[PDB]
Design a binder for this molecule. Structure first.
Ligand code: I0U
Length: 110
């Protein structure tokens, strides 16, 4: 990994760490729409994303730069904000995890 992608990988590790588990856990795995009874999910969300997918892509060297990584993390949050009413718990959890993400992403080395 490039220096910037090392920083990205560090962030990803943090987002998956026990430190943030109380609000990160809905983002660990793909939304299983059928299992959760969300029969409209894939009509509304055209491009699902979650942290396990981001992790697989990082491990497989799919991301060519930090921007591509960040786009997937933000897609995951955007999907949450798109699908869910803003007063649902999962949205509050997304906002908190995105705060973690954005503040550390901003510390990207040049
Ligand atoms: C609607 C709402 O506020 N919540 C609270 C948090 C959990 C959500 C349901 N859910 C999701 C989930 C659902 C939606 C709609 C979503 O956008 N994300 C990101 C995760 N992933 C889950 C994995 C497992 Br195991 C058990 C329950 C899970 C219900």
């Amino acid at each position: 990994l490039s220096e910037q992608l090392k920083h990205c990988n560090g962030i990803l590790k943090e987002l998956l760490s026990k430190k943030h588990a109380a609000y990160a856990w809905p983002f660990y795995k793909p939304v299983d729409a059928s299992a959760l009874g969300l029969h409209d999910y894939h009509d509304i969300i055209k491009h699902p994303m979650d942290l396990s997918t981001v992790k697989r892509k990082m491990e497989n060297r799919d991301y060519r730069d930090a921007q591509e990584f960040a786009a997937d993390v933000r897609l995951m949050f955007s999907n949450c904000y798109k699908y869910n009413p803003p007063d649902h718990d999962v949205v509050a959890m997304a906002r908190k995890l995105q705060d973690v993400f954005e503040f550390r992403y901003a510390k990207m080395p040049d």
